[PDB]
Design a protein around this motif. Structure first.
Motif, PDB file in Angstrom:
ATOM      1  N   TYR B 109       0.819  -1.222   0.000  1.00 33.59           N
ATOM      2  CA  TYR B 109       0.000   0.000   0.000  1.00 33.59           C
ATOM      3  C   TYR B 109       0.846   1.262   0.000  1.00 33.59           C
ATOM      4  N   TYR B 110       1.986   1.208  -0.668  1.00 35.53           N
ATOM      5  CA  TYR B 110       2.825   2.376  -0.772  1.00 35.53           C
ATOM      6  C   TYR B 110       2.050   3.501  -1.444  1.00 35.53           C
ATOM      7  N   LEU B 111       2.287   4.733  -1.004  1.00 36.01           N
ATOM      8  CA  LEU B 111       1.623   5.890  -1.606  1.00 36.01           C
ATOM      9  C   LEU B 111       2.216   6.184  -2.972  1.00 36.01           C
ATOM     10  N   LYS B 112       1.586   5.624  -3.990  1.00 38.50           N
ATOM     11  CA  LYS B 112       2.161   5.626  -5.315  1.00 38.50           C
ATOM     12  C   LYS B 112       2.380   7.031  -5.876  1.00 38.50           C
ATOM     13  N   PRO B 113       1.491   7.982  -5.543  1.00 39.93           N
ATOM     14  CA  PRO B 113       1.700   9.381  -5.955  1.00 39.93           C
ATOM     15  C   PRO B 113       3.080   9.920  -5.589  1.00 39.93           C
ATOM     16  N   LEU B 114       3.638   9.433  -4.485  1.00 39.08           N
ATOM     17  CA  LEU B 114       4.933   9.905  -3.983  1.00 39.08           C
ATOM     18  C   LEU B 114       6.128   9.198  -4.632  1.00 39.08           C
ATOM     19  N   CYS B 115       5.840   8.313  -5.574  1.00 37.07           N
ATOM     20  CA  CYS B 115       6.883   7.627  -6.301  1.00 37.07           C
ATOM     21  C   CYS B 115       7.574   8.595  -7.241  1.00 37.07           C
TER      22      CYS B 115
END
Lengths: 121, 121
Positions: B109-115
């Motif tokens: 559930y990593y915050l993909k936007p912050l990738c």
């Protein structure tokens, strides 16, 4: 986009959206639609019908603006598709919250082949 | 399709594919790529790159045949695109399994936007 959708779901439900609704019942998640298993699942059904009515923008990919004002999702788009998309997503998030009281973990990761074919939207 | 892909991941890894890899890091799961967070995530990165070479078929929707032979995924003859799709999926399932040793639930559930934006494939 799926990012706004996930965020709204988190905001409304307080739940990890991927964990709770990434695969739930016949309609919440990566696979298409199916006859809903419960109220939560029906929310996702309606949502998928909402998306399938949209034209002019890509429901999964297209970012849009919204705000969280007095703990309400406020869709900040004039553009008909992105606005409609925002409202699709807001509606499912609200629906999911409304139905947390019947959320049932046993429908998490439900096997698609156990689902009746969904009626036409 | 995601059905075959999930089954392969389950088979290789022994893990619920939706739970472990439906939203892991910057690359496993929805939408596109991002700078990978770890080896597991890089598997998904490579996988999404692999999907780019596919031309006459849809990775998400198109079914293909494979078999489990001596505990290996063996892709069915299929047509060119489905064959390569199958092999993309096989490769990621294998890679995910190979990298279970550094799988980190913190990236689930990593915050993909912050990738960061992904490099070119």
């Amino acid at each position: 986009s799926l990012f706004e959708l996930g965020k709204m779901i988190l905001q409304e439900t307080g739940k990890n959206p991927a964990k709770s609704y990434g695969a739930y019942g016949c309609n919440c998640g990566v696979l298409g639609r199916g006859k809903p298993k419960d109220a939560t699942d029906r929310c996702c059904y309606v949502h998928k019908c909402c998306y399938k009515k949209l034209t002019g923008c890509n429901p999964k990919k297209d970012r849009y603006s919204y705000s969280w004002k007095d703990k309400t999702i406020v869709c900040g788009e004039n553009n008909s598709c992105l606005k409609e998309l925002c409202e699709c997503d807001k509606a499912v998030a609200i629906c999911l919250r409304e139905n947390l009281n019947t959320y049932n973990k046993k429908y998490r990761y439900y096997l698609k082949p156990l689902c009746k074919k969904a009626d036409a939207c």
